[PDB]
Amino acid sequence: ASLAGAPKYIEHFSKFSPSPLSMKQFLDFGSCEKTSFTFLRQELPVRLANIMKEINLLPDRVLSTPSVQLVQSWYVQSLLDIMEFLDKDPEDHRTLSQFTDALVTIRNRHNDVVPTMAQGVLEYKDTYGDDPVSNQNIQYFLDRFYLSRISIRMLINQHTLIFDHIGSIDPNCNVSEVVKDAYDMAKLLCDKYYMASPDLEIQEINAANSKQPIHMVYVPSHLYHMLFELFKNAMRATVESHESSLILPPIKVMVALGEEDLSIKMSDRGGGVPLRKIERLFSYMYSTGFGYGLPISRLYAKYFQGDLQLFSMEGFGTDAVIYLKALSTDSVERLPV
Amino acid sequence: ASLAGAPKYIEHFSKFSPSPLSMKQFLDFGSCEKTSFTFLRQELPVRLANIMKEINLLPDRVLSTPSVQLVQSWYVQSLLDIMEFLDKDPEDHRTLSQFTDALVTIRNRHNDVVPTMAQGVLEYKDTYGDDPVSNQNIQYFLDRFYLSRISIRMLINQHTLIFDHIGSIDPNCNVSEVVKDAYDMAKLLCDKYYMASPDLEIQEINAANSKQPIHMVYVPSHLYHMLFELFKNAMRATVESHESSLILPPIKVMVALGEEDLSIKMSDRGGGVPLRKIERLFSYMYSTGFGYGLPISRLYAKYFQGDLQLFSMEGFGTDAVIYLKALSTDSVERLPV
Ligand SMILES: NC(=O)C[C@H](N)C(=O)N1CCC(Nc2ccc3cn(S(=O)(=O)c4ccc(O)cc4O)cc3c2)CC1
Ligand SMILES: NC(=O)C[C@H](N)C(=O)N1CCC(Nc2ccc3cn(S(=O)(=O)c4ccc(O)cc4O)cc3c2)CC1
Question: Which of A226, A330, B222, B303 has the most CB atoms in a 10 Å sphere around its CB?
Answer without folding.
Answer: A226
